[PDB]
């Protein structure tokens, strides 16, 4: 509740064994307003033969990022620090570890 002052292209989604697409999360009451989130194309991964292999899975890698939300609502130069969860990319996971 402490308010202070503060001074104000990649194509792996298409070349990965666990590809994904970008979703455009937009919130005008948020900085940054536009965040690109990842959603995997397939359940499995692409094997050497180029098919969807279901011995492995495509899962999103999710991180927590700091964002600024306008507090009070619809009020510039005034923000509340927030912590949201976004999907940055998809990776391929196997059930066997060696």
């Amino acid at each position: 509740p402490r308010t202070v002052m503060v001074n104000l292209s990649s194509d792996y989604y298409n070349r990965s064994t666990s590809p994904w697409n970008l979703h455009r999360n937009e919130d005008p009451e948020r900085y940054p307003s536009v965040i690109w989130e990842a959603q995997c194309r397939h359940l499995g991964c692409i094997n050497a033969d180029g098919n969807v292999d279901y011995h492995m899975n495509s899962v999103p890698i999710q991180q927590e990022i700091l964002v600024l939300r306008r507090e009070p609502p619809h009020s510039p130069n005034s923000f509340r620090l927030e912590k949201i969860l976004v999907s940055v990319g998809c990776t391929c996971v196997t059930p066997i570890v060696h």
Partner: single-chain antibody, 228 residues
């Protein structure tokens, strides 16, 4: 989807070697992993073989799994039988949409991850009920979960599944449209909403942790649900 056909029962003497088959009805068996589980009388199902032939820590090397692509079937071979091995043995594999368990083979010998279920009980035909699964001991958000039921007098039956993030949901045909699976990664709890229950839904519902979609690795205690 597909069916998994096992022999109904097998009976051998201690010390011999036994083989249990598991034939897939549709789809190439070599395209999806096969898992083997052991269920003792009144006990929770435990894993014996996963990923076709991978044996976990704690299972003696006399257990082993193998796959035959020409017959489209999988086999669990138990060499050197003993009284402890006397239990039910289920095979399990998957397709991109569902998870299927076999009918189960009853083997008779001739004479840390933690999952807690809750919410089961008695309910009227048509009522609603929700189960919870308290997960602990692992990164809950990084694992797909699933519900597996066992009706009294029947074998293991897959109910539903959910991805780690919660974006993908799967249901069995007998359950889809009436049940709703969801999860809360912040509280490490997995839920199963049940609506419009029928007398067939009387079963023990187990919580299941899956390394990948359709490869179950850990089981819960199970909660009893009776509808009458």
């Amino acid at each position: 989807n597909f069916m998994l056909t096992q022999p109904h029962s097998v009976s051998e003497s201690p010390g011999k070697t036994v083989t249990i088959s598991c034939t897939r009805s549709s789809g190439s068996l070599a395209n999806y992993y096969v898992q083997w589980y052991q269920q003792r009388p009144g006990s929770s199902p435990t894993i014996v073989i996963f990923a076709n032939n991978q044996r976990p820590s704690g299972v003696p090397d006399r257990f082993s799994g193998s796959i035959d692509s020409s017959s489209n079937s999988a086999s669990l071979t138990i060499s050197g039988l003993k009284t402890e091995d006397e239990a039910d043995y289920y095979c399990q594999t998957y397709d991109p949409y569902s998870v299927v368990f076999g009918g189960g083979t009853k083997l008779t010998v001739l004479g840390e991850v933690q999952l807690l279920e809750s919410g089961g009980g008695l309910v009227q035909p048509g009522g609603s009920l929700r189960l919870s699964c308290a997960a602990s001991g692992f990164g809950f958000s990084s694992y797909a979960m699933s519900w597996v039921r066992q009706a009294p007098g029947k074998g293991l039956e897959w109910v539903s599944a959910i991805s780690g993030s919660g974006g993908s949901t799967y249901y069995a045909d007998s359950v889809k449209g009436r049940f709703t699976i969801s999860r809360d990664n912040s509280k490490n709890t997995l839920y199963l909403q049940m609506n419009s229950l029928r007398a067939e839904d009387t079963a023990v519902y187990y919580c299941a942790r899956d390394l990948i979609h359709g490869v179950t690795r850990n089981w819960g205690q199970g909660t009893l649900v009776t509808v009458s």
